[PDB]
Design a binder for these strands. Structure first.
Ligand SMILES: [Mg+2]
Ligand SMILES: [Mg+2]
Ligand SMILES: [Mg+2]
Ligand SMILES: [Mg+2]
Ligand SMILES: [Mg+2]
Ligand SMILES: [Mg+2]
Ligand SMILES: [Mg+2]
Ligand SMILES: [Mg+2]
Ligand SMILES: [Mg+2]
Ligand SMILES: [Mg+2]
Ligand SMILES: [Mg+2]
Ligand SMILES: [Mg+2]
Ligand SMILES: [Mg+2]
Ligand SMILES: [Mg+2]
Ligand SMILES: [Mg+2]
Ligand SMILES: [Mg+2]
Ligand SMILES: [Mg+2]
Ligand SMILES: [Mg+2]
Ligand SMILES: [Mg+2]
Ligand SMILES: [Mg+2]
Ligand SMILES: [Mg+2]
Ligand SMILES: [Mg+2]
Ligand SMILES: [Mg+2]
Ligand SMILES: [Mg+2]
Ligand SMILES: [Mg+2]
Ligand SMILES: [Mg+2]
Ligand SMILES: [Mg+2]
Ligand SMILES: [Mg+2]
Ligand SMILES: [Mg+2]
Ligand SMILES: [Mg+2]
Ligand SMILES: [Mg+2]
Ligand SMILES: [Mg+2]
Ligand SMILES: [Mg+2]
Ligand SMILES: [Mg+2]
Ligand SMILES: [Mg+2]
Ligand SMILES: [Mg+2]
Lengths: 204, 87, 79, 66
RNA sequence: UCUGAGAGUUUGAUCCUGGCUCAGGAUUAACGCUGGCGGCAUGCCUAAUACAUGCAAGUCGAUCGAAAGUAGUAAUACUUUAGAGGCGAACGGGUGAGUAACACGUAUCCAAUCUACCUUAUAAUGGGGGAUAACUAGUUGAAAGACUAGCUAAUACCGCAUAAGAACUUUGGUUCGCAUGAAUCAAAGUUGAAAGGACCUGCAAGGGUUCGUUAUUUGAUGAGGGUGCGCCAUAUCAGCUAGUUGGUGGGGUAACGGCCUACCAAGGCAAUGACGUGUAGCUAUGCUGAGAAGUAGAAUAGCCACAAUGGGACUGAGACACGGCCCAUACUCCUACGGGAGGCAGCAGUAGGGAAUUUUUCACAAUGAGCGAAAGCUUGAUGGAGCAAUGCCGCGUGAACGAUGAAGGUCUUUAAGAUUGUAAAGUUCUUUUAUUUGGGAAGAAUGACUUUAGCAGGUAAUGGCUAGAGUUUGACUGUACCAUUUUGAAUAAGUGACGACUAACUAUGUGCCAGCAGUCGCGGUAAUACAUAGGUCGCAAGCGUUAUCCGGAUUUAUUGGGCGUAAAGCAAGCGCAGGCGGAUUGAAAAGUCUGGUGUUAAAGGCAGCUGCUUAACAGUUGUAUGCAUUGGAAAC
């Protein structure tokens, strides 16, 4: 369950999946809002609601998340101790298929989600099929063995390009993760904290 | 005629009982008098977290247990304590 | 729409009612005889019948007690 | 079905009402006509739906063109 | 350590008062369009309307006579139950009609009470009698049945002998109390019980275990009563009440009581709201709110009331008894016309009402209930399985590569061009889902019972206790789930909106017509508001519209508003009751503050943790508020 026009959505929001693969393309290098009414005036002065909605949509499309799941996670995180601007970021980044992407065994986040749903991924001491499990740094998320021989495993095992917050112990595909991602590892695609306030208003 | 017996507070396909001192004529999963201790059929080990104090008080008062309750008192050894306190 | 247990209980309680009514009427006539011709002898019979009925449960034991107490009060007042 | 007679606006272009039919009213309020405070659900009972409509048809009771 | 967002709309334009509308949640929801699956949970809100049909409380032969069947030459063995008897049918299940009050919540007093089975402890379980079910025969009938005469049995019933202790009194003592009045004696008088069964041993006599019975004793649970406080609207309801208020004697009730009775009195409540009318089951809680609080009393749990309507009563520890009894009313049905049968607000299900809410199912396998020693039996309680996107949560319609651009559509900045658009075509890959193959649980990680070993009381034997073995038991169930099992992107996307609030615009057609609208308001021949198309935006197995509730609304303002000109100071005065009130001292402690104790059922809320692939969900620990009592503080 996801959109099939990630190019269109990236062109609208202006922010791709941090690689600009859906912006560079092989044609026209288009960086405009889609549709016929893309090259018009009235660019800035987006309302507060408009910019909050745009940022929230970018955040919840960067990971393939349904808004109801977003409300659920926010209601989960909100009650604890206090200012959790360091906790809810870990909460949002701890997705299993997201961790598979930052592991580097799939070309794209939703392709990793498809593999997770199809059951080519294991866990610390169990197996996981649902691509929404909340993880905690310390679990040995070891990859499957019968999926290392599939005709599409090359770019999967080419994980030498990896994020520093996912440690694989290369050539062993152990793929654990410690040293939670910082705002540096969460790039400028969405780096704002009043989406938190928007969900505070629209969710008690 | 209080009767130490079980009471279900689980969900569909997952029972969970509580040993409790309750009257004979009151319905199952209703109002009770004193709580003894919970129990899970699939707790593997220590399936009955027993109290051993107010339970002994109520059997001394004259509570009549059930088959399952007597069994639970038995594996832990509460039946021995009751019989020796009777003697 | 009927139960054999209920029917049997009805058939039993008819006979039980007959016997108990006989006993209660005997008690009534004995206490009436006592009050009619007051005499310390009849108080013993009142005692016996009331106690027997109270044990059998035909009469309420507390009513038997009050009957005994009031008859003894009458006897003590008159003597 | 109760004993109250109400003036109800038929929300559509063209109707099959024949001065004697069974309709299913819902709440609403047309601003132009004073006294009218109900609408007729289209295409649920004896009253036929609104064909020749592809936009916002789910409100007017029109089968999907497919 | 709590903790609160606003905007549109009166005017040529502005400020304020002020009403309307919207942005957010939620439901026992319904409707339109569409629709793939799983985990939890919910599912006649209306006609307490009427019900076809099938099931929903029985059990014990180790209480008793008889009868039947299978074996046996017989004596007899085994099995079964129509009937008597015991226990249970007052639990459990449903509904919310009635009820505005001790109905309910809370705190209490029952010196004014009951309590079967259960717990502890303590004496007995001796001996007789008369009957009737079942059966036999006759009358009456198709049968239900009914009537009459005989025959039996007991743990059915009625006497008698006997009271360790009981109940009611007498005599004086004790300790007293809260006014009636309770508590304990020492002696005496009167009254008062029952039943045996199973098994073992013993030649017998006798002895023994166990179940059960009578009379008591201790608690505990359960039931009942009284009182203080809290608990709807309405004065466009001002008087209501004659068993109503009080006293004396008696009766009745488990108990006090005008509860009832006969006599004597005239009192009782009421403006601090009687009474009348309307409405409603109450509460823990659900939803909402920053809070004070608003609103509904889904599911479930506590209590109350009801069982077609209205009365009465038997049995019983307990009923004035949903599927017990008697009578009347209304209705339906059967008849061979004399007579009868009936109560789904129990589980499914039918008709009807409605916008609308499901199988005419399986199993007692676990939990619980009743009977029983067990075998077991019964359990529409209960556990499952069907149906339904009804709600929350979860997963899918694919993945990589792929034209500075396939076709088609829409705009053409009248060749060029954009846009849909890596979207597509095409090359490879996977199978949550789908279709075959193999394996396959969790709950029954319990259990009752029976042969064993050991301890254990008494011992001369049997029962109870622990360990092992066995029968071991599944509706779900060949189900959840698992595996390199064959095939294959194959089996899966809709709905609303785009002038502003509010993220998102062009063309065609119509031309104050057809139509839209939550508000401002669009449409009079150049419509981004109508209808269609394209494009785009918000959500997504759901999306919109409708209804209701809360918030925003400081818009009934205690927290938290006002009355010169915007709604609002009575025309003015004399003023009872009420509210408020100068300064100082003393006492008490009704308000106020604080310590201890009891309680405020469980579930629900918040915090922590565990288990379901994480969640929803389940479980577990902690977590307040008020009332009462007792002990202090003395500023107001
Ligand atoms: Mg104007
Ligand atoms: Mg109803
Ligand atoms: Mg029988
Ligand atoms: Mg009942
Ligand atoms: Mg129920
Ligand atoms: Mg009502
Ligand atoms: Mg009894
Ligand atoms: Mg005899
Ligand atoms: Mg007898
Ligand atoms: Mg005698
Ligand atoms: Mg508020
Ligand atoms: Mg309820
Ligand atoms: Mg209801
Ligand atoms: Mg009826
Ligand atoms: Mg009786
Ligand atoms: Mg019935
Ligand atoms: Mg009954
Ligand atoms: Mg039914
Ligand atoms: Mg069962
Ligand atoms: Mg659903
Ligand atoms: Mg979902
Ligand atoms: Mg073209
Ligand atoms: Mg693609
Ligand atoms: Mg098993
Ligand atoms: Mg429209
Ligand atoms: Mg339009
Ligand atoms: Mg308000
Ligand atoms: Mg309002
Ligand atoms: Mg004002
Ligand atoms: Mg004025
Ligand atoms: Mg004036
Ligand atoms: Mg004036
Ligand atoms: Mg004056
Ligand atoms: Mg005054
Ligand atoms: Mg509680
Ligand atoms: Mg919970």
């Amino acid at each position: 369950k996801y959109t099939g026009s990630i190019f269109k959505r990236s062109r609208r929001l202006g922010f791709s999946l941090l690689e600009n693969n859906k912006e560079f393309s092989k044609g026209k290098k288009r960086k405009t809002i889609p549709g016929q009414h893309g090259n018009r005036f009235r660019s800035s002065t987006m309302s507060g609601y408009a910019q909050q909605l745009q940022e929230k949509q970018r955040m919840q499309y960067m990971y393939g998340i349904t808004d109801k799941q977003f409300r659920r996670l926010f209601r989960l995180v909100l009650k604890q101790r206090g200012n959790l601007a360091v906790n809810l970021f870990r909460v949002l980044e701890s997705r299993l298929d997201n961790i598979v992407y930052r592991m580097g065994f799939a070309p794209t986040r939703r392709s990793a989600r498809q593999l997770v749903n199809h059951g080519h991924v294991l866990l610390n001491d169990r197996t996981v099929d649902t691509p929404s499990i909340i993880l905690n740094p310390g679990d040995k998320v070891r990859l499957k063995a019968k999926t290392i021989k599939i005709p599409i495993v090359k770019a999967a095992s080419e994980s030498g390009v990896v994020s520093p917050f996912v440690e694989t112990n290369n050539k062993t595909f152990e793929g654990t993760y410690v040293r939670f991602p910082e705002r540096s590892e969460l790039p400028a695609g969405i780096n704002e904290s009043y989406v938190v306030e928007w969900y505070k208003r629209l969710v008690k | 005629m209080v009767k130490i017996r079980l009471m279900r507070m689980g969900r569909v396909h997952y029972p969970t009982y509580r040993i409790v001192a309750v009257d004979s004529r009151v319905k199952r999963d209703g109002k009770y008098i004193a709580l003894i201790g919970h129990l899970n059929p699939a707790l593997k080990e220590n399936k009955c977290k027993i109290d051993e104090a107010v339970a002994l008080e109520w059997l001394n008062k004259g509570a009549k247990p059930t088959d399952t309750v007597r069994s639970l008192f038995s594996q832990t050894g509460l039946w021995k304590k009751f019989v020796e306190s009777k003697k | 729409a009927n139960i054999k247990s209920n029917e049997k209980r009805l058939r039993q309680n008819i006979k039980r009612n007959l016997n108990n009514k006989g006993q209660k009427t005997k008690l009534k006539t004995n206490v009436k005889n006592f009050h009619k011709e007051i005499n310390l002898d009849n108080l013993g019979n009142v005692y016996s019948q009331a106690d027997r009925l109270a044990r059998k449960g035909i009469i309420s034991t507390n009513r038997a007690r009050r009957l005994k107490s009031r008859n003894v009060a009458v006897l003590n007042k008159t003597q | 079905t109760n004993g109250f007679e109400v003036l109800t606006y038929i929300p559509g272009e063209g109707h099959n009402l024949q001065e004697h039919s069974v309709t299913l009213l819902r709440g609403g309020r047309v601003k132009d006509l004073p006294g009218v405070r109900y609408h007729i659900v289209r295409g649920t009972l004896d009253t036929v739906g609104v064909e020749k409509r592809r936009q916002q048809r789910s409100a007017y009771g029109a089968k999907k063109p497919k």
